[PDB]
């Protein structure tokens, strides 16, 4: 089997295992700010610097995922508290949509909302264009930020949340637990097909945008991952 | 929301909120060891004290849940290596079944495999009287241990294993991450209507069981579990 | 050459390769415990019976070895996590001091925190009285707990720790390398001349031990070995 | 702390954590054949394609790392073997010597038997230019395959060898251990300052080479590694 894992604990500059894209910045504490508080439309983008073979198409096999995460956002005076957070996959080359207007976007898509990836957001903000629930939520990903389905959520205001999402091949299931910090779980699953949306390289990672009265702190504490494929 | 969460880093005979059910023992270290490596067909299985309502009969909604727990099977000289854990969701009444004959049924089921449960094994044998696969694996069982779905998996003596499970109400999709102790790790995932198959008040557990010539040391490490009932 | 080499995959009570002093005791799952949860002051130690000749008078020649063994320990209800673990060689006609407090002293030393033994602690509690560094540590002992050097460490309970050691004999190097449970390493090597230190013909072991308040689960769950002295 | 951690059981093609330089080969096995039986002077390389960061110039520290890995050497009719494995670490921008003529440079050193790496060696043939040992032998080289020190050893044809190694910051020891087919063990330490000696980001990785006269089968079987850096 072609098993790839990594444990962060904590994020330091220059560790060439990590890809920073934008106003991404690591903290002292060894956390990463993935938003720049002084910019409009910050967008800052983490990405696992390897790129992680999820299907191949010799064999026809895809991998089964684990990962955990959690992190964290704080409101800051006197800003709107937004956009939040999305986990995502892309191809490998992929890239801050070019003239992004971050907001509703949240990094990964162009403004109609559209975009080449898979991910899993933690949106604190209403964006009637792009169909979101009228309140914070978590939300599944394909090729755009208008979910496929989306879960009713609360975003904390420094609260640490905590998220472990696994993927099973077989069944090509996406299945997301979201802990929060009053001790709740908050649960979504979505049947992607992985093997048909994105090529057999791609890249994991983190992505938050705010907008000129939009913006908060986007925290990401700490990130395992494991993905294993089957080679026959 | 009916939130329902508990976390053992370790047991201990006498902790009111576990259940002990035939030859479960407690050892000094904190481990549970399911079965007695000197009785024949030996049967021991352990379960949270307090039953957890999964499902509304006045709502009709069900509950999602987060678990993960970290087991450890060792082989003993010169007896088979059988024959595995079964964490299980069973009726709060349950009991292990008369007359049982362990081995195969793992201490869930009948002779002829039936049983009332809902489970994620960790067969260690072939029995094809369950039509078992012919390897090691890991299945979902539902009131069968002829399981519904399996996946090739390798029981490797001594090592940790850690399992993490998601139960996503919407969907009713039941998902299992394990992660070897070379890091490998492996899926399975089932859609599975608890409301369908067991009662609104139910008892979560783990169950293991031997045969006169399979046996094998079965140790349950840890098990945190967090429920989370929509009571609207 | 004169090779030495033996492994446990699990330990049992009755296996004359082993020498069991104090108040060690075997598991049903195979794990050697060192200390009586329930002592006061417990010392438990585990010697590999057959003495090995780590160095040639007629020679001059010193062996090299290499060994690698994985151990555990747990916290207990509340009650210090003390003292930890020593991976030591000794004269063949080791035993544990006479009037032995434990504690601190690791079962390998008299009250001055003197004795006649090289090895490598996993040190949990910090004594003042042998000059312990303020945190959980692993040191290089020589005839002394007031280790020769030490390493700051972190004693994650019920976290299974593997470590790997080297001993050059040309160099009269010895390393260490423990690996935690979230995959990081901390390592410490050391010039030592066992030739100078110890006798011809020395035992191998580990030791642990407690005091009245300082009480914890001092597990070794496996241990491979092997020493090379060339003779010529 | 910053850690890098993976493990290889098995290769396959296509994997993007593996990077292959010159004459290698993935066989169906999952194993790796350095050179190319049929070719004159035959190299190959396989680098772990993440580059590692061992040393940070704003904090100093060097990173400690283990990792130990298994390979084999078997002769082919009726050539000469000739010439050996070398486990290196290089620049991130490492390629396979220039006009390299293969054999006693083990393909990282030009002809002078210069290069830029710091690696172990398993060589199997006595190149005089380069004064090795008069028999088969391991060695630490820096930047040179003229050894900073050797150590005899015996490369048995068809055996199958496991080494590990501990590379610890503080005394910036590197320590081998080499186990032979026959239980028997080689050890060889030497400090290198790979800070000073290496740049800060490096790759880690084996290399094979042969000659007109010299062939034989050279394979790498697995490989785990696991660095961590202080950050603080
Ligand atoms: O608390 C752990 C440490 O205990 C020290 O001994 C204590 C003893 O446990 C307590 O009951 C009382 O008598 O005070 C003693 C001295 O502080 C050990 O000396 C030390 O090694 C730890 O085990
Ligand atoms: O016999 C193995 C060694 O060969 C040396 O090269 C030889 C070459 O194989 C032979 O055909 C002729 O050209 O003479 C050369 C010089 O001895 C390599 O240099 C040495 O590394 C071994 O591979
Ligand atoms: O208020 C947060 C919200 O802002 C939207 O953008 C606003 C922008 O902040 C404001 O300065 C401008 O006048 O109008 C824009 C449109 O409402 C973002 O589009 C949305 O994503 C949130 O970030
Ligand atoms: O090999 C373990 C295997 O045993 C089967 O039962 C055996 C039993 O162990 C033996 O004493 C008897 O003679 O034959 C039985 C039939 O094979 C169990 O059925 C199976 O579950 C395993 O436990
Ligand atoms: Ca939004
Ligand atoms: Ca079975
Ligand atoms: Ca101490
Ligand atoms: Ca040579
Ligand atoms: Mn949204
Ligand atoms: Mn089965
Ligand atoms: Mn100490
Ligand atoms: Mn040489």
């Given at each position: 089997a072609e098993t790839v894992s990594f444990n962060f604990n904590s994020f330091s500059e220059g560790n060439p295992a990590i890809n920073f894209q934008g106003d991404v910045t690591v903290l002292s504490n060894g956390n990463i700010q993935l938003t720049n508080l002084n910019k409009v439309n910050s967008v800052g983008r983490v990405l696992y610097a390897m790129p992680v073979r999820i299907w191949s198409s010799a064999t026809g096999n895809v991998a089964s995922f684990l990962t955990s995460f959690s992190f964290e956002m704080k409101d800051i005076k006197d800003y709107d508290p937004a956009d939040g957070i999305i986990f995502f996959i892309a191809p490998?080359?992929?890239?801050?949509?070019?003239?992004?207007?971050?907001?509703?976007?949240?990094?990964?898509?162009?403004?109609?909302?559209?975009?080449?990836?898979?991910?899993?957001?933690?949106?604190?903000?209403?964006?009637?264009?792009?169909?979101?629930?009228?309140?914070?939520?978590?939300?599944?990903?394909?090729?755009?930020?208008?979910?496929?389905?989306?879960?009713?959520?609360?975003?904390?205001?420094?609260?640490?949340?905590?998220?472990?999402?696994?993927?099973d091949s077989s069944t090509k299931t996406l299945s997301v637990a979201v802990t929060n910090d009053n001790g709740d779980i908050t649960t979504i699953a979505q049947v992607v097909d992985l093997k048909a949306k994105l090529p057999e390289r791609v890249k994991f990672g983190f992505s938050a945008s705010g907008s000129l009265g939009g913006r908060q702190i986007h925290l990401i504490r700490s990130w395992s991952f494991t993905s294993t494929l089957i080679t026959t």
């Open positions: 490998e080359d992929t890239q801050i949509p070019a003239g992004s207007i971050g907001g509703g976007t949240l990094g990964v898509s162009d403004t109609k909302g559209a975009g080449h990836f898979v991910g899993v957001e933690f949106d604190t903000y209403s964006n009637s264009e792009y169909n979101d629930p009228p309140t914070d939520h978590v939300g599944i990903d394909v090729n755009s930020v208008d979910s496929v389905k989306t879960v009713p959520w609360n975003s904390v205001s420094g609260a640490v949340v905590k998220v472990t999402v696994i993927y």
